[PDB]
From a paper:
However, it has been established for the H1 (1918), H2 (1957) and H3 (1968) pandemic viruses that a change in the binding specificity of the virus membrane glycoprotein, Haemagglutinin (HA), of avian viruses from a preference for α-2,3-linked sialo-saccharides (avian receptor) to a preference for α-2,6-linked sialo-saccharides (human receptor) is a prerequisite for efficient transmission of avian viruses to humans. However, surveillance of human H5 viruses has revealed a number of H5 mutants that show enhanced human receptor binding with HAs that contain other amino acid substitutions in the receptor binding sub-domain. We have carried out structural studies on the HAs of a number of H5 mutants that were isolated from infected humans in Vietnam and Egypt to explain differences in their receptor binding properties. None of the substituted residues in the mutants we have characterised make direct interactions with the receptors; they appear to have their effects by perturbing the biochemical properties of the receptor binding pocket.
Residue numbers in the entry:
A (entry chain B), B (entry chain B), C (entry chain B): 1 to 162
D (entry chain A), E (entry chain A), F (entry chain A): 1 to 321
Amino acid sequence: GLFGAIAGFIEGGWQGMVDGWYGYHHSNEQGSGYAADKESTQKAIDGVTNKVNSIIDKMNTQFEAVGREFNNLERRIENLNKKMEDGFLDVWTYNAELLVLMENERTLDFHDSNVKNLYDKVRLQLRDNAKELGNGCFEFYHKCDNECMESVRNGTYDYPQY
Amino acid sequence: GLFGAIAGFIEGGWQGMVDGWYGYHHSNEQGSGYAADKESTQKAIDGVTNKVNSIIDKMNTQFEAVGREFNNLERRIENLNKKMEDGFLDVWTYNAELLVLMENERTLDFHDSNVKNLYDKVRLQLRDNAKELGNGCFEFYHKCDNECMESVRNGTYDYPQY
Amino acid sequence: GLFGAIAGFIEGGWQGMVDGWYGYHHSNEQGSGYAADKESTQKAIDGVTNKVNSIIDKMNTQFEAVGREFNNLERRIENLNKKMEDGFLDVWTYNAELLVLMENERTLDFHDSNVKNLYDKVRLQLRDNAKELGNGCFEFYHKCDNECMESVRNGTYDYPQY
Amino acid sequence: DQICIGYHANNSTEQVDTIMEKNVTVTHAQDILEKTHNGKLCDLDGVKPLILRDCSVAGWLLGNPMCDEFINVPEWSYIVEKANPVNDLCYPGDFNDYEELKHLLSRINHFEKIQIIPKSSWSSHEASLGVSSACPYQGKSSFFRNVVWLIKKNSTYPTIKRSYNNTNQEDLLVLWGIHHPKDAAEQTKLYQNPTTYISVGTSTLNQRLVPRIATRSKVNGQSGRMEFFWTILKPNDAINFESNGNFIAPEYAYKIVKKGDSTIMKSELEYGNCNTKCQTPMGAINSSMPFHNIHPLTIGECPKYVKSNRLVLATGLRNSP
Amino acid sequence: DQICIGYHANNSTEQVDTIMEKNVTVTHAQDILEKTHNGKLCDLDGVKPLILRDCSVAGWLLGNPMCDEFINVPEWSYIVEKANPVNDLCYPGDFNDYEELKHLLSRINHFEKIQIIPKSSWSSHEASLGVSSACPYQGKSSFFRNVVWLIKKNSTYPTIKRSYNNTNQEDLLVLWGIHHPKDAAEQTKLYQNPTTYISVGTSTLNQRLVPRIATRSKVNGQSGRMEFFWTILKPNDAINFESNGNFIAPEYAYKIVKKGDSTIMKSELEYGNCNTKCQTPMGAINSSMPFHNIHPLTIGECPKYVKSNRLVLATGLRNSP
Amino acid sequence: DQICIGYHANNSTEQVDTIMEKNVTVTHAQDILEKTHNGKLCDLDGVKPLILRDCSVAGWLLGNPMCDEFINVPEWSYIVEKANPVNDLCYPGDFNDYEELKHLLSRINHFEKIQIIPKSSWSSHEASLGVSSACPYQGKSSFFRNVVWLIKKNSTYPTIKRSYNNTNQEDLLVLWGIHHPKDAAEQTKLYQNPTTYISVGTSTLNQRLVPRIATRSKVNGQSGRMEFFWTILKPNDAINFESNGNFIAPEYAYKIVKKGDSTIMKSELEYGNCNTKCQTPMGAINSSMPFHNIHPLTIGECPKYVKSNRLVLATGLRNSP
Ligand SMILES: *[C@@H]1O[C@H](CO)[C@@H](O[C@H]2O[C@H](CO)[C@@H](O[C@H]3O[C@H](CO[C@H]4O[C@H](CO)[C@@H](O)[C@H](O)[C@@H]4O)[C@@H](O)[C@H](O[C@@H]4O[C@H](CO)[C@@H](O)[C@H](O)[C@@H]4O)[C@@H]3O)[C@H](O)[C@H]2NC(C)=O)[C@H](O)[C@H]1NC(C)=O
Ligand SMILES: *[C@@H]1O[C@H](CO)[C@@H](O[C@H]2O[C@H](CO)[C@@H](O[C@H]3O[C@H](CO[C@H]4O[C@H](CO)[C@@H](O)[C@H](O)[C@@H]4O)[C@@H](O)[C@H](O[C@@H]4O[C@H](CO)[C@@H](O)[C@H](O)[C@@H]4O)[C@@H]3O)[C@H](O)[C@H]2NC(C)=O)[C@H](O)[C@H]1NC(C)=O
Ligand SMILES: *[C@@H]1O[C@H](CO)[C@@H](O[C@H]2O[C@H](CO)[C@@H](O[C@H]3O[C@H](CO[C@H]4O[C@H](CO)[C@@H](O)[C@H](O)[C@@H]4O)[C@@H](O)[C@H](O[C@@H]4O[C@H](CO)[C@@H](O)[C@H](O)[C@@H]4O)[C@@H]3O)[C@H](O)[C@H]2NC(C)=O)[C@H](O)[C@H]1NC(C)=O
Ligand SMILES: CC(=O)N[C@@H]1[C@@H](O)[C@H](O[C@@H]2O[C@H](CO)[C@H](O)[C@H](O[C@]3(C(=O)O)C[C@H](O)[C@@H](NC(C)=O)[C@H]([C@H](O)[C@H](O)CO)O3)[C@H]2O)[C@@H](CO)O[C@H]1O
Ligand SMILES: CC(=O)N[C@@H]1[C@@H](O)[C@H](O[C@@H]2O[C@H](CO)[C@H](O)[C@H](O[C@]3(C(=O)O)C[C@H](O)[C@@H](NC(C)=O)[C@H]([C@H](O)[C@H](O)CO)O3)[C@H]2O)[C@@H](CO)O[C@H]1O
Ligand SMILES: CC(=O)N[C@@H]1[C@@H](O)[C@H](O[C@@H]2O[C@H](CO)[C@H](O)[C@H](O[C@]3(C(=O)O)C[C@H](O)[C@@H](NC(C)=O)[C@H]([C@H](O)[C@H](O)CO)O3)[C@H]2O)[C@@H](CO)O[C@H]1O
Ligand SMILES: *[C@H]1O[C@H](CO)[C@@H](O[C@@H]2O[C@H](CO)[C@@H](O[C@@H]3O[C@H](CO)[C@@H](O)[C@H](O)[C@@H]3O)[C@H](O)[C@H]2NC(C)=O)[C@H](O)[C@H]1NC(C)=O
Ligand SMILES: *[C@H]1O[C@H](CO)[C@@H](O[C@@H]2O[C@H](CO)[C@@H](O[C@@H]3O[C@H](CO)[C@@H](O)[C@H](O)[C@@H]3O)[C@H](O)[C@H]2NC(C)=O)[C@H](O)[C@H]1NC(C)=O
Ligand SMILES: *[C@H]1O[C@H](CO)[C@@H](O[C@@H]2O[C@H](CO)[C@@H](O[C@@H]3O[C@H](CO)[C@@H](O)[C@H](O)[C@@H]3O)[C@H](O)[C@H]2NC(C)=O)[C@H](O)[C@H]1NC(C)=O
Ligand SMILES: *[C@@H]1O[C@H](CO)[C@@H](O[C@@H]2O[C@H](CO)[C@@H](O)[C@H](O)[C@H]2NC(C)=O)[C@H](O)[C@H]1NC(C)=O
Ligand SMILES: *[C@@H]1O[C@H](CO)[C@@H](O[C@@H]2O[C@H](CO)[C@@H](O)[C@H](O)[C@H]2NC(C)=O)[C@H](O)[C@H]1NC(C)=O
Ligand SMILES: *[C@@H]1O[C@H](CO)[C@@H](O)[C@H](O)[C@H]1NC(C)=O
Ligand SMILES: *[C@@H]1O[C@H](CO)[C@@H](O)[C@H](O)[C@H]1NC(C)=O
Ligand SMILES: *[C@@H]1O[C@H](CO)[C@@H](O)[C@H](O)[C@H]1NC(C)=O
Ligand SMILES: *[C@@H]1O[C@H](CO)[C@@H](O)[C@H](O)[C@H]1NC(C)=O
Ligand SMILES: *[C@@H]1O[C@H](CO)[C@@H](O)[C@H](O)[C@H]1NC(C)=O
Ligand SMILES: *[C@@H]1O[C@H](CO)[C@@H](O)[C@H](O)[C@H]1NC(C)=O
């Protein structure tokens, strides 16, 4: 992806994280586990939901075909009628398929961006109190218990404290 | 935004920066103030201006309706005429509204990208001679007077000097 | 570009790198030279090739004009025929020119993103065993011979070893 | 001790296409194209369609004797006609401005048949021998039930001067016809007068028909032809007929009681004993999808037709192997 | 000491829409849709339109006596006709190929009326009693001023053989008509000869009209009808009339002096004493916007019509609360 | 010691446009618009087109004596007609439903001319004096070769009753005509009978033509006119003619042996001695590009026409100065 996180420096997703799209995995002497980042997950839900409705809504007004019959010496206008109905169908088919391809690319990239921003957000808190391992993980210099871990997810990791 | 800067790690904009879209705020013993980054600001003006003209220009050639009258036993072709005029209006309405939505998203993201690149540009100069605070700001280890500050905006911050 | 690498913090391209789109330049006591990153280069080839075929393919089904002749007292339907043929041409001309502009922007940005991700990939390996110079280059603290250089391109640069 | 940033994965095999890559597996996706129908013709919103079966619109309206099923049809939602109905014009000929009339029917949901010129009010002409073997009924020769094929009585066809005044509140569809005979002998044999005409007038109409004689190929055993005409008689207007022979007189005409949304749907399917909100010529649709690919000609509250085989939007993210 | 990177904010409340988010407040934006008009019909680029008022195009061209305002109209930019003008055909009937003629007018900016067959050159026929109460003027019976309704003189209608040669450099619009009487008595009463015709020939035209008699409903107090025909007579060609009765002869015909961009605009509005560069049926437009949503049918140098209520492009960036 | 990350550059001057920036130099690009043609009319896929040269479709089909080149034409891929062919109707008149016939030809690749009513089987009428100076051939007066202009023999024109039965397997295009004389004297001079007709019947057709007399301007030295009609006679159907005078009888009619993809292409160009897979009115196309901008009306396997002057996709990346 464009933002380098999903299937990039973070090699793969987590089957174990059930409660959100993006989040954290912690590991210390007390144990280990997953926790979803609620804010960024809900941001993603809102953006994608609005998008789907925007797509549906834009394709609301669209060409509707109507039956018109012509006799044996009205072949020219019959053909004109046929070319007109077909022409509009092709235009709207094109619009629909292109919109889906284009927006699918942007949706995948959007998720990649949200993972990247979450990662940077944590990176900017920890600063030089942790080793950036290069795979999505940060290895602490100090011991980081569950309250410590929670403050990283909070946004309130007290860097001067460590 | 996709690039994480605007309303991301930089929480909010500056009412105090009047002379440009992006720039710097400095703070030392001599005082404090704002200064616009001219180059990246002008880059943004050119890109957005070209875009607006590109949008207007592409919608230059477009369907124009013409009055055609039909009698009481030409209902089929009257209806064909009506469906054709309407059909094209709907197609062009769709094109116009979609182009605006899509390009508005890209314009906001473009600005976000320009802030991110300006931030990184400064980060790559300062390197480890300053603390990355995580909010858009860099706190210096040495004392940085107005000439010092100016060299950061220059691109000529002499890292070996400090 | 949106991702800041191409014509950004990496000022210019390399005439000397002939065998790929993106890669590395090394410089030590043994000598210097270029080497293409095969994986990311081939990724770019596949994405751009699929794109071109996707573009061509979407424009496959499209309005075809047909000759229809009318007499001197069929001016209204002649005009309708003319406006219909022209209308569809303008719609498809618009679609074609807009698709090219939009996707050209994304192609240039795609390349920029691939350079940025390659750069970060190297940055995350080296960590604090090298000075980030700010121009695309990393200056090593230890001496880095050709095997050393090769492990950076590998992905197997043993940070604990240095 | 460490903390890691990461993203969701699951057992999804759903795939989406993008510009640069096809068949990308994603954690979640949303199909937006309806691909299925029930394969049946159904009531629209409770209101049953008019299924003409083997009859055409002409056979119905003129009252082809093989179309007695539709002698008095209740209001319809839409109309269903086969591509090549066998019961069209039983006696060969033409229906003038037929296509423009069928178009008129797309804005009509209900007719009320009424009598304007009683069959048993033609005292100066024979009005019960106007039949042919080309229009059979129960083994006997019959004719289009809604119009009267008048002939001479005791070797005279005196001039007809008949007028009907539309005292109804509703627009009225009036049908009539002219008969084209095989040759000069048939003309006098039926109508006596050798040179004839039919003149029809309203406030808008100014018609005068004359029979064209010509040697014609047999069609359903007849060399003669019937050419049928129509008009819409507005309220308080009167239609005026004058004729010398060859006149196919109106017996019944249709009141247009309800105008609204309708359509003539071409289909070989029969009634499905069934209900839907959206109907197509090959079956009904029941979905909340914004798109479908069943058929372009639909009626009701429908998704938009597209020619695609597949429209699937990514909602979730790229799924891991 | 510190240096910070940041971005502009201001007091803007302007909002734009994107695919993922609606009503995003931005620092700067640019509206590209013109939503206003002045509500008036105006001169286009100085050149005043032809405002037919209560007259139709037929009433104008034939010279309906209630349309003397337009007896000689200067060149126009566009034409304005009401949806249902009251002064159309005062004497009831038809205007043949009327719609094709109105289409012809979309490529015409100026007519010059000239006389081709003088009213006082009909020495063998009465040419000053061709009037009716359906076409009144100042309390008296009158008629379409541009054509002459000829009748018999001293109980004879001798054959007419009249020819006009287009010696003008400019194409010529020629109008004429045929009268349909109520019955056989009216025919002889006006024209003597019981069976009549009108034959018209040019290099392209080969016409022969015959009057259709029929009992017709009264329209403006008349059972009779007038059917009007036209042709474009090319330079150096001649039009040839021969008639037996029922002929409505050309008196005046229109030279086509200027061809160019025009349109027949349907509107109930009157003249606005006003000037514009872009006109619509509900008012004029004066803006530099690339789009508008006033009305699809415009004339002049206009923005492109779209059905949108709102088109606003983001120029600046997301604004902070 | 250092390692650097970087990207390709080269000597490319290729440029592409984007929304925000025009004329961006890139390392690689791909043109997708074909801009060139060979300027010639060519065989389509080996199969040569019918190039009517100075003849029109009417002149060809009726057999205008100046169009003997096309007296028997092999099967074609497409047809090429000039904008204003000089050899159209040599004797002035009309070709009825001409445009609908030309449309029919877009679905036809080959005719086979056959004789249905032999010229030397008109024993009761003169069938070898039906000529005019308006249709010359080698200095002498001639006529449309495919139809017979019959006149009276020894001062009598007895009624014609002729029938042709289509025993061929293939649909048949039948042409005939009616002659309009200058005046009453010419009528009797050619046909004796003063009031005449032509009646034509098939299973579908019910026609009766009457000659319209009128004083007409001379066109190619003739005041008289010829009006030409046609029908498609289906297999096992018969066409029936009855006439009193003024009949232009069929001599030859065209079998429709091959139906398929064709087109009438309007062009002033002549044959190019040349082969292509995709043809336009201004030249042939030979490229693998998905688009072209030569001309909208093409035939064959072609790229899609667009109005663009330039379509170039970026493949590589931004190139460095
Ligand atoms: C088909 O048959 C229709 C009737 O069966 C016939 O309708 C018309 O018939 C006559 C035509 O002369 C009209 O008779 C009189 O009605 C007028 C009433 O005006 C209005 O007000 C009353 C109020 O109660 C309404 O009922 C009525 O609907 C109408 O809206 C009346 O004014 C007029 O008489 C006048 O008297 C004046 C002096 O008192 C005179 O100045 C004036 O000249 C006039 O003589 C009129 O004669 C019917 O009203 C009318 N029926 C209607 C409208 O329903 C159709 O004409 C017939 N069609 C054809 C083609 O023949
Ligand atoms: C409507 O009325 C029109 C005139 O009022 C009439 O126009 C035509 O009238 C006659 C038709 O016979 C023509 O008379 C002669 O003009 C020819 C001149 O040729 C050209 O050169 C001169 C140069 O000064 C131009 O003025 C002129 O416009 C033209 O372009 C002349 O050549 C020809 O005579 C010939 O003589 C030859 C021997 O010398 C012969 O071989 C040959 O056969 C011929 O006799 C011709 O007779 C008018 O010129 C012409 N008027 C024009 C073109 O303006 C229309 O015909 C009439 N319409 C109808 C339907 O009747
Ligand atoms: C143009 O000219 C055509 C011939 O030159 C003419 O075609 C028709 O001509 C007569 C019309 O009466 C038909 O004659 C008889 O053919 C029927 C045969 O049926 C089928 O089977 C045979 C099998 O070998 C096929 O050849 C044949 O094509 C056909 O498909 C026959 O059944 C029928 O006779 C019947 O006898 C029955 C008792 O045995 C009776 O109940 C019944 O009433 C009938 O008398 C029929 O008479 C030709 O077959 C037919 N030609 C064809 C189809 O090719 C066209 O009619 C003529 N066009 C016009 C407008 O006149
Ligand atoms: C080809 C051959 O050997 N003989 C035909 C001969 O059959 C034909 O006579 C007509 O035949 C048809 C059936 O093919 C009908 O039987 C015609 O009779 C009727 C009819 O049934 O239609 C009787 C009916 O009572 C008549 N009704 C009235 C109101 O007149 C009608 C009517 O006259 C005609 O339909 C009008 O066109 O006809 C029967 O006449 C003759 C054609 O007359 O030709 C032989 O060659
Ligand atoms: C219904 C009833 O009680 N009586 C009508 C009777 O009124 C009608 O006569 C005609 O009435 C109309 C008005 O309704 C006119 O007055 C007709 O007269 C004129 C006319 O003004 O149009 C007089 C005019 O001088 C005539 N002009 C010429 C050139 O002939 C015309 C002309 O003849 C006709 O318009 C041609 O159709 O008529 C007056 O005749 C009669 C219908 O004749 O019917 C009664 O039932
Ligand atoms: C204007 C003038 O000075 N004189 C014309 C006079 O020329 C004209 O006669 C006709 O002239 C034309 C050429 O302009 C032909 O020569 C006509 O003759 C022919 C013809 O060639 O077409 C002879 C031919 O044999 C005839 N063929 C048959 C089958 O009848 C035809 C035919 O009768 C007519 O074409 C039918 O319309 O004509 C010659 O008649 C006369 C018009 O008759 O008018 C003078 O004013
Ligand atoms: C996010 O997480 C941090 C760290 O876990 C939160 O700080 C902690 O908050 C808890 C619960 O409010 C505090 O618990 C308190 O303990 C004292 C006894 O020591 C007791 O008297 C109180 O009743 C309460 O249970 C805890 O002290 C505190 N710890 C630290 C190191 O700060 C923080 O509040 C969270 N912030 C957000 C925005 O979610
Ligand atoms: C960007 O900013 C840096 C730092 O401010 C610039 O360097 C400084 O440039 C100024 C003005 O040219 C120099 O001032 C000079 O002072 C000496 C006396 O010391 C005097 O003789 C000269 O006449 C002049 O006024 C200053 O010395 C210099 N300082 C440093 C630390 O470099 C730099 O030139 C700017 N570069 C760009 C690209 O804008
Ligand atoms: C990428 O590059 C690294 C570093 O160049 C590779 O490790 C090196 O691999 C080479 C070739 O396989 C090894 O050479 C060996 O040398 C020994 C003698 O010392 C000899 O017995 C073997 O036959 C062989 O020639 C070399 O030892 C090794 N060096 C280091 C420091 O690891 C690595 O294999 C590459 N990995 C990938 C994924 O490409
Ligand atoms: C993406 O996956 C689709 C879905 O399976 C593939 O479509 C199949 O393609 C094969 C080979 O052309 C056909 O025989 C099958 O009929 C297709 N199956 C279905 C369900 O459509 C497609 O090949 C894949 N596309 C790409 C570009 O790899
Ligand atoms: C975005 O803002 C617009 C503009 O105010 C909102 O439009 C209003 O919507 C309400 C509720 O539907 C209507 O009653 C008003 O008439 C609308 N006002 C105007 C000026 O259009 C809209 O609701 C907002 N959209 C979203 C998605 O939040
Ligand atoms: C995939 O996982 C879901 C849990 O969301 C489970 O319900 C389903 O049974 C699983 N499907 C398969 C095929 O294992
Ligand atoms: C349509 O199908 C859905 C099943 O998804 C069902 O809930 C609904 O009742 C159906 N409606 C009708 C009219 O059959
Ligand atoms: C917003 O700020 C601008 C300065 O650009 C000022 O002119 C304007 O008065 C302000 N508007 C309001 C409502 O305060
Ligand atoms: C159009 O309105 C603008 C106001 O923005 C004004 O400058 C211009 O003069 C106006 N033109 C006309 C013709 O009214
Ligand atoms: C540009 O470089 C290419 C090498 O790919 C070479 O073939 C070509 O000659 C060069 N063109 C010019 C104009 O120097
Ligand atoms: C078309 O031109 C190409 C040159 O690119 C050539 O290879 C091919 O043979 C040509 N085909 C024809 C039919 O001229």
